[PDB]
Amino acid sequence: QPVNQPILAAAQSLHREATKWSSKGNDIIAAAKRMALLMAEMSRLVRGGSGTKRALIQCAKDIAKASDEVTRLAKEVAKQCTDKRIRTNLLQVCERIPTISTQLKILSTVKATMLGRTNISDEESEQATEMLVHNAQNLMQSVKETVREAEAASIKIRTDTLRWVRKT
Amino acid sequence: QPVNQPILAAAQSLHREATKWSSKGNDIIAAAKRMALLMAEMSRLVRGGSGTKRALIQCAKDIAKASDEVTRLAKEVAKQCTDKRIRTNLLQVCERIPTISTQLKILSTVKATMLGRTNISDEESEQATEMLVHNAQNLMQSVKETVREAEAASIKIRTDGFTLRWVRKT
Q: What are phi and psi of B21, to 5 degrees?
A: -110, 150
If one counts every other C-beta atom within 10 angstroms of the C-beta of residue B37, the result is 17
Chain A from 89 to 108: CB within 8 A of any B CB: 98-99, 102-103, 105-106
CA–CA gap between residue B108 and residue B110 (Å, rounded): 5
Q: Are B78 and B95 in contact (CB under 8 A)?
A: no
Q: Are B147 and B28 in contact (CB under 8 A)?
A: yes
Nearest alpha-carbon partner for A161 in A82, A77, A86, A94:
A77
Q: What are phi and psi of A124, to 5 degrees?
A: -60, -40
DSSP A129-142: HHHHHHHHHHHHHH
Q: Which residue of B has its CA nearest to A131?
A: B103
Range of the domain at A155: 1-168
| A63 CA to centre of own chain | 6
If one counts every other C-beta atom within 10 angstroms of the C-beta of residue B72, the result is 14
CA–CA gap between residue B124 and residue A135 (Å, rounded): 15
Rg (CA), chain A: 17
Q: Are B28 and B159 in contact (CB under 8 A)?
A: no
Q: What is the count of structural domains for chain B?
A: 1
CA–CA gap between residue B83 and residue A7 (Å, rounded): 39
Q: Which residues of B touch A110 (CB under 8 A)?
A: 106, 109-110
CB contact under 8 A, A102 and B110: no
CA–CA gap between residue B103 and residue B137 (Å, rounded): 12
CA–CA gap between residue B10 and residue B43 (Å, rounded): 10
3-state percent breakdown (helix, strand, coil) of chain A, nearest 5? 75, 0, 20
Q: Are A2 and A43 in contact (CB under 8 A)?
A: no
CA–CA gap between residue A148 and residue A50 (Å, rounded): 39
Q: The domain spanning residue B49 has which CATH number?
A: 1.20.120.230
Cβ-Cβ contacts under 8 Å for A137 (sequence gap 6 or more): A6, A10
Q: Which residues of A touch B127 (CB under 8 A)?
A: 99, 102-103, 106
Tally A–B CB contacts below 8 A.
29
CA–CA gap between residue B141 and residue B13 (Å, rounded): 8
CA–CA gap between residue A31 and residue A72 (Å, rounded): 11
A20 residue type, one letter: K
CA–CA gap between residue A113 and residue A121 (Å, rounded): 13
- B94 vs B22, B60, B70, CA distance in Å? 21, 18, 8
Angle at B101 between CA B129 and CA B155, to 5 degrees: 125
Total length of chain A: 168
A107 residue type, one letter: L
Given in angstroms, what resolution was this structure solved at?
2.8
